[PDB]
Amino acid sequence: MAGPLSGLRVVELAGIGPGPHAAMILGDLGADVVRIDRPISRDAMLRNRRIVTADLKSDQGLELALKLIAKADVLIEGYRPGVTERLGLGPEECAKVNDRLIYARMTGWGQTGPRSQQAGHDINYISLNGILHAIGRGDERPVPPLNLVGDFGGGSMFLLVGILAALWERQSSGKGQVVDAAMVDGSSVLIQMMWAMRATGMWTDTRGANMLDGGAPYYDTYECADGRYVAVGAIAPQFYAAMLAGLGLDAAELPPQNDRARWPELRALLTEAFASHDRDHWGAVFANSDACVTPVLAFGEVHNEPHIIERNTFYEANGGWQPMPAPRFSRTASSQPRPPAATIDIEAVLTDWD
Amino acid sequence: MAGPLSGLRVVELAGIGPGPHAAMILGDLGADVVRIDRPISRDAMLRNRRIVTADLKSDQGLELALKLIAKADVLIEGYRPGVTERLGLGPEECAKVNDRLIYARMTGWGQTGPRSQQAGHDINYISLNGILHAIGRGDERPVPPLNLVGDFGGGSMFLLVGILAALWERQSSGKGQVVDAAMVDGSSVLIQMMWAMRATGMWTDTRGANMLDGGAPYYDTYECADGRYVAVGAIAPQFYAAMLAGLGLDAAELPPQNDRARWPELRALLTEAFASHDRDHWGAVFANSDACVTPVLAFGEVHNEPHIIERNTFYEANGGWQPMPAPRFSRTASSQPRPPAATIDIEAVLTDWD
């Protein structure tokens, strides 16, 4: 298995959403991941795994699980706190068979506290820490940024960081430990730039009136003639200049870039400009420039974009496309992910692992 | 320095946005981070660092930088590809003095390909790979989800994974290597669940019409009597049921949960319900159940929410709050972050590095 984590052994206890994403990226990077499910998946997410089944509530399944865990470097669970405890797969039971184990707990609310037993989803976790409030336009109610901020950016990615960090630690203490990965905490650190900016006046709690939330005419999308969109990210003065130059707008006749009072005016002039031609016309105009103007591609157009083609950001599977592994490593490169295969036998895996 | 990365040594070449966030998280977990800037910061982001100064264009600063790197585990750089190269700090130069270095390159577009020398910001990277199109309501142009998805979720957090993965690979090879972390690749993997779902009919390219983008009346925010919001995440039938009960709605009077054809009706009835009382009324109704209904708090309210208080998700600083370290480690815990203190002389750090 190619990648920098070639050699690492991960048990994943089948759950939903953030946990399997973390397991995926470990497999993507060469880890040997073995997912235990309840008694062929067409879910690309379950790439780079072997799947086995066990009934964790039977003595026999309990015992099989504990033997896999005994040979593994990592365990990923995403159940309510107290669930593995009650199954006999809690941290203390695991430690008795494998004190080198990195026991990784993926939750929304974390291991303890008033909401720790309560159900929730991404939207709930980012609702509670200021993130969801800060998304969207001032004249509309907060829109969920899918589940990219709670589940993934501030969920699985923090689990991953904790897992790999605790592996580095183990390299000098010889022991593992428990990683408590709560989406409510991970997403907060994810948005630390904004908490920093609050204290210096570089960000306000008012919706849709900041530099990065759609409040700024140079940091937004614009609708073009064909009803399709471009994205403008032209923050530096020299990027802004380049963007006005492509539009054929005379800076002398426009409000200054950072005269907020005149941002309505600026936006309206930018709107009328971008609306005068189709999306793809602006890709030609701004070609090779620092204007920070890009087409906004729908998923089904992505695989035709040259920079995406040239770098192999996606690979073909099933319906269509899935993202290749990230990030990239110069010497131990990942290979194209392996599909979900049929189930396999658990004793088989033990015997492979010895 | 407390945490699992105690002992790790990181040189950070000063730049913007994703790279400093990666350096932060390493510092938060115990690393020894030393940021080289140009000739006290009040940027909470620069917490858990020592700042040194050098002119890398000058024989003397290049040589001082090279001596630091010589002693480090990890280098972070966020410039245009080709910049360290021409400065004398390219991967091949660093390898000459330290072949165990993890050389970690944080870009938007990546090291090679047609856009790799073009300026860009978060909004641009996620414009190109389908993510930004997928954000927001069907009747509004795509709204940026701040810079959570490209700069951090798919940016710094992948740089981190790459760094720590490479450190693991280095334990058996005895060598480092280069990590090419491009926001356009990391964000794609971040959104892999959607690319999975496209192939199984569980996600459409149509904006504002999916389970997680605000298309579903049970996964969205609603305006309350006071003009504030709640978030509803009630996907599972039993969660939905609890939500209807807290609203005092009779299930039999409503359309089925997943009759999409009557989702306008279902939304209107939910709209009317939530509008009848103020956010904090619903925050109380829904405080304990599995209804998946949470108040949408603004940042300035967060620190008063019981669950946030009890788990110490934030700490005081510079007249505001900042997020504590994430994730959490049961044995080598992180401490409260150290502020950005004054500069330090670079020879003094070299000395300290035995």
Numbering used by the authors:
A (entry chain B), B (entry chain A): 1 to 39, 45 to 359
What did the article's authors report about this structure?
α-Methylacyl-CoA racemase in M. tuberculosis (MCR) has an essential role in fatty acid metabolism and cholesterol utilization, contributing to the bacterium’s survival and persistence. It catalyses the racemization of α-methyl-branched fatty acyl-CoAs, converting the (2S)-epimer to a near racemic mixture of the (2R)- and (2S)-epimers. The enzyme enables the conversion of α-methyl-branched fatty acids derived from cholesterol metabolism into forms that can be utilized by M. tuberculosis for growth and persistence within the host, a key component of M. tuberculosis pathogenesis. Within each active site, the large domain contributes the catalytic residues H126 (part of α-helix 3) and D156 (part of α-helix 5), while the small domain contributes a third catalytic residue, E241 (part of α-helix 9).
Crystals of the three MCR mutants H126A, D156A and E241A were obtained using identical conditions to those used with the wild-type enzyme and diffracted to 2.45, 1.64 and 1.85 Å resolutions, respectively. The overall structures for these single mutants were very similar to those of the wild-type structure, with small root-mean-squared deviation (RMSD) differences of 0.38, 0.37 and 0.38 Å for 693 Cα atoms of the H126A, D156A and E241A mutant structures being observed, respectively. The three mutants collectively had fewer hydrogen bond interactions; within the H126A, D156A and E241A mutants, 3, 5 and 5 interactions were observed, respectively. The active site of the E241A mutant stands out, as the relative positions of the active-site residues D156 and H126 are identical to the wild-type. These two active-site residues remain parallel to each other, and part of the PEG molecule is nestled in between them; consequently, most of the associated hydrogen bond interactions are retained. Within this mutant, the H126 residue is hydrogen-bonded to the peptide nitrogen atom of A241 through a water molecule, and due to this interaction, the movement of H126 gets restricted and it does not pivot away like E241 within the H126A mutant. This important structural water molecule within the E241A mutant active site resides where the functional group of the E241 side-chain was. However, the introduction of this structural water molecule does not replace all the hydrogen bonds lost in the active site. The rate-against-amount of enzyme plots show the expected enzyme-dependent increase in rate, while the specific activities calculated for wild-type, H126A, D156A and E241A were 46.4, 3.2, 18.5 and 12.2 µmol.min−1.mg−1. No significant change outside the enzymatic active site was observed in the three mutants, establishing that the diminution of catalytic activity is mainly attributable to disruption of the catalytic apparatus involving key hydrogen bonding and water-mediated interactions.
